[PDB]
Design an enzyme around this catalytic site. Structure first.
Site, PDB file in Angstrom:
ATOM      1  N   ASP A 186      21.367  52.767  40.082  1.00  6.80           N
ATOM      2  CA  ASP A 186      22.723  52.394  40.450  1.00  6.80           C
ATOM      3  C   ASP A 186      23.095  52.957  41.801  1.00  6.80           C
ATOM      4  O   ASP A 186      23.448  54.148  41.924  1.00  6.80           O
ATOM      5  CB  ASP A 186      23.689  52.921  39.384  1.00  6.80           C
ATOM      6  CG  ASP A 186      25.117  52.561  39.693  1.00  6.80           C
ATOM      7  OD1 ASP A 186      25.349  51.691  40.549  1.00  6.80           O
ATOM      8  OD2 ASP A 186      26.047  53.131  39.043  1.00  6.80           O
ATOM      9  N   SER A 244      30.338  43.013  55.940  1.00  6.09           N
ATOM     10  CA  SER A 244      29.754  41.708  56.153  1.00  6.09           C
ATOM     11  C   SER A 244      30.535  40.964  57.243  1.00  6.09           C
ATOM     12  O   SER A 244      31.749  41.148  57.399  1.00  6.09           O
ATOM     13  CB  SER A 244      29.784  40.920  54.838  1.00  6.09           C
ATOM     14  OG  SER A 244      29.374  39.578  54.996  1.00  6.09           O
TER      15      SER A 244
HETATM   16  O1  LIG Z   1      28.741  45.242  36.490  1.00  3.98           O
HETATM   17  C1  LIG Z   1      29.114  46.038  35.590  1.00  3.98           C
HETATM   18  C2  LIG Z   1      28.327  46.026  34.349  1.00  3.98           C
HETATM   19  C3  LIG Z   1      26.904  46.430  34.710  1.00  3.98           C
HETATM   20  N1  LIG Z   1      26.074  46.366  33.497  1.00  3.98           N
HETATM   21  C4  LIG Z   1      25.894  44.944  33.145  1.00  3.98           C
HETATM   22  C5  LIG Z   1      25.502  44.647  31.711  1.00  3.98           C
HETATM   23  C6  LIG Z   1      26.028  43.464  31.180  1.00  3.98           C
HETATM   24  C7  LIG Z   1      25.735  43.087  29.872  1.00  3.98           C
HETATM   25  C8  LIG Z   1      24.905  43.904  29.094  1.00  3.98           C
HETATM   26  C9  LIG Z   1      24.395  45.092  29.629  1.00  3.98           C
HETATM   27  C10 LIG Z   1      24.679  45.473  30.942  1.00  3.98           C
HETATM   28  N2  LIG Z   1      30.220  46.823  35.738  1.00  3.98           N
HETATM   29  C11 LIG Z   1      31.078  46.896  36.799  1.00  3.98           C
HETATM   30  S1  LIG Z   1      31.975  45.431  37.282  1.00  3.98           S
HETATM   31  C12 LIG Z   1      32.750  46.341  38.598  1.00  3.98           C
HETATM   32  C13 LIG Z   1      32.338  47.614  38.624  1.00  3.98           C
HETATM   33  C14 LIG Z   1      32.858  48.599  39.632  1.00  3.98           C
HETATM   34  C15 LIG Z   1      31.957  49.409  40.325  1.00  3.98           C
HETATM   35  C16 LIG Z   1      32.440  50.321  41.266  1.00  3.98           C
HETATM   36  C17 LIG Z   1      33.810  50.408  41.525  1.00  3.98           C
HETATM   37  C18 LIG Z   1      34.706  49.601  40.822  1.00  3.98           C
HETATM   38  C19 LIG Z   1      34.239  48.680  39.888  1.00  3.98           C
HETATM   39  C20 LIG Z   1      31.345  47.941  37.582  1.00  3.98           C
HETATM   40  C21 LIG Z   1      30.752  49.263  37.332  1.00  3.98           C
HETATM   41  O2  LIG Z   1      31.528  50.157  36.937  1.00  3.98           O
HETATM   42  N3  LIG Z   1      29.403  49.389  37.490  1.00  3.98           N
HETATM   43  C22 LIG Z   1      28.688  50.649  37.241  1.00  3.98           C
HETATM   44  C23 LIG Z   1      28.035  50.577  35.851  1.00  3.98           C
HETATM   45  C24 LIG Z   1      26.641  50.482  35.710  1.00  3.98           C
HETATM   46  C25 LIG Z   1      26.071  50.394  34.437  1.00  3.98           C
HETATM   47  C26 LIG Z   1      26.883  50.433  33.302  1.00  3.98           C
HETATM   48  C27 LIG Z   1      28.260  50.549  33.421  1.00  3.98           C
HETATM   49  C28 LIG Z   1      28.833  50.606  34.700  1.00  3.98           C
END
Ligand SMILES: O=C(CCNCc1ccccc1)Nc1scc(-c2ccccc2)c1C(=O)NCc1ccccc1
Length: 330
Positions: free
Chosen positions: A35, A199
């Site tokens: 990440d 970008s």
């Molecule tokens: O895109 C995601 C989900 C990533 N895992 C996808 C998944 C989907 C289905 C099943 C299993 C895994 N979250 C978002 S959306 C926006 C953010 C974010 C990041 C930084 C700052 C503000 C918002 C994030 C975010 O918080 N990403 C960091 C993260 C990484 C892994 C797990 C939890 C959080």
């Protein structure tokens, strides 16, 4: 030194990517989500509340002869999406793709939120943002990359994510066979702890390129591409029947659509995201409404170049004294 590890989508939608990581002696291999938008290396463990573990592989520090409790240290993280985890801290030997760091902080989860429990394929996270974001208290810890950097042949790592296919994370070298054309480098601000860049604009499908500055982060741990509402509206206006659904939580479109590509600028260069990369499938099983892969950042406070964008490129995270980001087509 260098390291090279394959990263594999967790499911048919490329919702996230997992990379095997060796922890401890003898090695315990866990599949971690690398990440670039966070800075903690944390794992499901023998300390994790039993009801919060459902199929993950766990790290057991008592079985590692090199593990040492980092006395008094705790950690607690909240992600931008509302998920969270917390626990205590060990140091141990961690290896990725043949690159070994001794004394790496391995944050052992005592608690994880439901979204983590519910995803049996992800055993923890390996943060690759700047160490200023690391949550260990009272003594903040360094990322794996920061600990490795001085030993690397070059102070870089690269992300080459696949579309519906495995890809690669390399440390310490640039594989010049992994991309086409040249790598365009662009400036990074580390002020918020992220790989934050600007970008130079965008195009939708075969439309004309709009020059406009879009400040955002290169984030391998976020699935989708989150951009300003004006940009996102311009994209989805080219898809018959697409609409923003407050009930679903973003733009949806008919599953029968063929999506246009989306181009983003990196300096004078252009990265093209094929339309198919933007399809995240039915909103619920059997539905003919599909979820879009380009969504508004308006609720978030930051634009995010997540996997949808990054997987269209070969991406260099250059951790030289003044960091920069490189993008090439592939
Ligand atoms: O895109 C995601 C989900 C990533 N895992 C996808 C998944 C989907 C289905 C099943 C299993 C895994 N979250 C978002 S959306 C926006 C953010 C974010 C990041 C930084 C700052 C503000 C918002 C994030 C975010 O918080 N990403 C960091 C993260 C990484 C892994 C797990 C939890 C959080």
């Amino acid at each position: 030194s260098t390291g090279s590890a394959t990263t594999t989508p967790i499911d048919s939608l490329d919702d996230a990517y997992i990379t095997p990581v060796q922890i401890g002696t003898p090695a315990q291999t866990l599949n971690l989500d690398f990440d670039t938008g966070s800075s903690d290396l944390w794992v499901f463990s023998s300390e994790t509340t039993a009801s919060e573990v459902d199929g993950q592989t766990i790290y057991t520090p008592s079985k590692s002869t090199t593990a040492k409790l980092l006395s008094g240290a705790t950690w607690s993280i909240s992600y931008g999406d509302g998920s969270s985890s917390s626990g205590d801290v060990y140091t141990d030997t961690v290896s990725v793709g043949g690159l070994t760091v001794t004394g790496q902080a391995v944050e052992s989860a005592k608690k994880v939120s439901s979204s983590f429990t519910e995803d049996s394929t992800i055993d923890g996270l390996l943060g690759l943002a700047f160490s200023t974001l690391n949550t260990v208290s009272p003594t903040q810890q360094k990322t794996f990359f920061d600990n490795a950097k001085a030993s690397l042949d070059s102070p870089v790592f690269t992300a080459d994510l696949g579309y519906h296919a495995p890809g690669t994370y390399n440390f310490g070298f640039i594989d010049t066979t992994a991309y086409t054309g040249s790598i365009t480098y662009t400036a990074v601000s580390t002020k918020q702890g992220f790989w934050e860049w600007t970008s130079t604009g965008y195009a939708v499908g075969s439309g004309t390129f709009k020059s406009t500055s879009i400040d955002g982060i290169a984030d391998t741990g976020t699935t989708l591409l989150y951009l300003p509402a004006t940009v996102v509206s311009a994209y989805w206006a080219q898809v018959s029947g697409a609409k923003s659904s407050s009930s679903v939580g973003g733009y949806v479109f008919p599953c029968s659509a063929t999506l246009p590509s989306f181009t983003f600028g990196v300096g004078s260069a252009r990265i093209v995201i094929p339309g198919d990369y933007i399809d995240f499938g039915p909103i619920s099983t059997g539905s003919s409404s599909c979820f879009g892969g380009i969504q508004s950042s308006a609720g978030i406070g930051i634009n995010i170049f997540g996997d949808v964008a990054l997987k269209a490129a070969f991406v260099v995270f250059n951790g030289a004294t003044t960091p920069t980001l490189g993008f090439a087509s592939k």
